[PDB]
Amino acid sequence: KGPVAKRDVLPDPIYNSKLVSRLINKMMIDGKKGKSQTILYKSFDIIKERTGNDAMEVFEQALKNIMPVLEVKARRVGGANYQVPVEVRPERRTTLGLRWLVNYARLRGEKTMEERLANEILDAANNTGAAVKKREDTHKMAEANKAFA
Amino acid sequence: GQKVNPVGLRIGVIRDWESKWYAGKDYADFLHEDLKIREYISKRLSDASVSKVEIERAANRVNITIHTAKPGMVIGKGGSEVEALRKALNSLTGKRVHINILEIKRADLDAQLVADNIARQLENRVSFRRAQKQQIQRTMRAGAQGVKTMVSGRLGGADIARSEYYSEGTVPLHTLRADIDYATSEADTTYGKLGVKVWIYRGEVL
Amino acid sequence: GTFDVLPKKEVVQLKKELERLEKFLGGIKDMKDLPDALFIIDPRKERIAVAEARKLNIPIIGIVDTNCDPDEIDVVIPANDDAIRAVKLLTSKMADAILEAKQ
RNA sequence: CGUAAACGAUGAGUGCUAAGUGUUAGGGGGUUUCCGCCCCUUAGUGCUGCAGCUAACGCAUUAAGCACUCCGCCUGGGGAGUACGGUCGCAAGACUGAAACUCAAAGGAAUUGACGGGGGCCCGCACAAGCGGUGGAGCAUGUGGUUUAAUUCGAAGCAACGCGAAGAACCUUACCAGGUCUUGACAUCCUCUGACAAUCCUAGAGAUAGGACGUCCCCUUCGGGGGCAGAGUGACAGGUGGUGCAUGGUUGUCGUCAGCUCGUGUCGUGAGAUGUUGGGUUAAGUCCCGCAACGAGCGCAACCCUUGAUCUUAGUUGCCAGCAUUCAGUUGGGCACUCUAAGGUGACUGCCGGUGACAAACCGGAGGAAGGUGGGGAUGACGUCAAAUCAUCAUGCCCCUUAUGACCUGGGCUACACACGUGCUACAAUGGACAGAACAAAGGGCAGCGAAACCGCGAGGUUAAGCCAAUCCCACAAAUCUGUUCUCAGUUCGGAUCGCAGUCUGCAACUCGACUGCGUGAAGCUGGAAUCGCUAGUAAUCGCGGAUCAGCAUGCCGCGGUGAAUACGUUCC
Structure with missing residues (x-):
């Protein structure tokens, strides 16, 4: 079987980042970039x-x-x-x-x-926010179950 | 759910069309006229052992070639055979029919005549081992790189009907350059209906 | 014959096949007929050849070892079957014996 | 007490019958005072092994060998180690020990399989990792029940249930009700006498008739012969009647799984084994190496079809690069380019390096349009489910025959309290409405495709060009992009349902068609337990096309448009 890997596109015409186009491919509904x-x-x-x-x-x-x-x-x-x-x-x-x-x-x-994306970035910057509840809670689940590693 | 017929599988690779023309405006009508032709001619020469009929359509004219494996039963005395054959076709089709009869040397390599020869012996109450083994020796001496004859039905055994393989040599149904003759025949016996499936791997083309 | 079939069907068929068939069918290649006898070097090492020799009732000459069975071999020679000079000596004597025979 | 799978499931004694090898307690020898090595012999205790034995497993000098002596015990399984009697025992029980009745087996050892909540290895959207759904609502569709005159029949876990049905208004259509028919609606017969047709009127829901009118057949040397018509007569027909547990043929499924076998040989008393196992390897019983096997066949792969690229030929109806004209590739002009369709070339682990046995193969690199069967398709081994199909067809047998057959109209297959598969549309701002701009592929068209113009709000309509089609049409692609607008509500969401008015098809849209126009506007605010699909141009989404077909598509079959997320891994199903 073995591991297979994927690719992604380098620029954005404003904000030249890899990961911002990775967010563009994310949140795409029904094939609409x-x-x-x-x-x-x-x-x-x-x-x-x-x-x-x-x-x-x-x-x-x-x-x-x-x-x-x-x-x-x-x-x-x-x-x-x-x-x-x-x-x-x-x-x-x-x-x-x-x-x-x-x-x-x-x-x-x-x-x-x-x-919503603007205010979620503005909340996740100054860390207290809605997705960071999930960040904190996953670290709490790892903190509680640390006896196994 | 099993094997595609090799005749229909190798059409348009190496095996030609039997029915060779081009459609003008009554393609269905030419088809069903030729189905009536093939029914009539295969019924009439199922005594005289005709395998295959290739039909042309040549602008109001039809060239029928007939592969028989004996000439003088079907061209015969010359006059009488061509009279009773071209004349009734000119009637039951409605236009000119020309008949060219090619004779199959090595009568035991064409699977239609071979399957009919096995079917008649079942109707002649010859045992269903003797038919297939005798015919496999006949075909493998007539020269073929493989033969497979499979007979199914009630073999003279009542409440269970089963399939029977006999074969010699390579019969490679997956090689798409094979030139394999496949042919069915049916044998209506007193105990029901037997089905003969013979296919003869004869040799491939490089 | 024709040496031009495919670019490499001569490779994948011919070469691959020549290797195994030459290496294993050796100099018994041109045998054409059943042999009369059989000269082996070790019966314990080669019980299959000794077995079907005794089955086919071919009389056998042979060097045996002290752990081998002299009852099974028709003609028993006691000597060294893994010292190359002893086996060279015995095959030498027997090949000279058969070379002195056809006259 | 007096019993244990109290066993080595192997009575005691004795003698004989190859070896190899540990070990326990001794003895003696060949050099050494020794340590210690070797040799030799006892008795006990292990293992492997020859002959021999055995049904085989196996035993084999510690016998299950070859013998002799003596003892104990067995004579199918159950009932049953039971009951009765006796002896012994405090008791529990032990020992001795049947019979009626009942069965055709019980049993040993081994073989092939299948299975295991046994071990190993591996693989697949199988699991995980994700993305979207189904289950909730509305509708479309199929199925169970139930209502029925009939709700025709067939399918029934995976492998039935948007299945046969690639198109139930009539037809189909079988089923029902009513009117009917009886060599018959369909095909060979026999005998005649000539054409059959065609229309009109009456019936009649139509079939079926009464009729009128009309019959023109022909071919020859005169006898006839190719039709069609009726008219008899009887052979026969006709069954979508049953049986897919009688069948042929054709399919699903395991499963595109990698298996399934055979020849000759050898092994085994035999069933069987061998190959086919073992090591690496593969997508692969693929391939290599070793091997009591050597081969072969059906499978696997390859050839076959498509897509990915380029060369030659071939340029019109296709293309417009430079040559000028054009409302327009329209014209002149050109085969460069795309395109098209033929022949090619091309990718083979071939070359490099590395690993591994040097093999087979594997990991990366260069080139290249293409990299490791490049993507897909077609191909579905031996057989498994007495799987499915007697309703596509052909069928053996059984049944019906003035009817279980045939015609005709009307209904039903669209019923509806309910469940239940598959689907479509939404519940909404990545949204709705309104206006502008663009980009496709593939396929269809002769009583068919139908431009343009005109009219109608619209569905569409009238006249009609062109087109048997790379020309002309279907054909004004849609999501998309860009502006305007609502502002998070059961709403500018959604469209069910329904009233009215229309349109097209067709004898005919009432049950029972699609579509339009106006209006009404419902359930629904992302769905419990549970559950499905997908590994890349895929999933998600958007339209287009075609079969079928007068008309009916949300189904199916293809086509393009935009176009992802994730795969650590095999712990678990």
């Missing part, structure tokens, strides 16, 4: 406006707050249902960070996902 590109650039223009900063550094700070060190996997032996904590390899750190940004942004609820 155009709508996700529109949502993303209008959101980052809100992040450049509402806070007078470049939104690249705010976006990496939000990622750094969300990227989880420790997943907690499963291990059922007998009738025990133990969860076992896993040191996450950093690709999955970035992609769990992007899932938590996208999911808790669209789960928030405001008058566009432009605004």
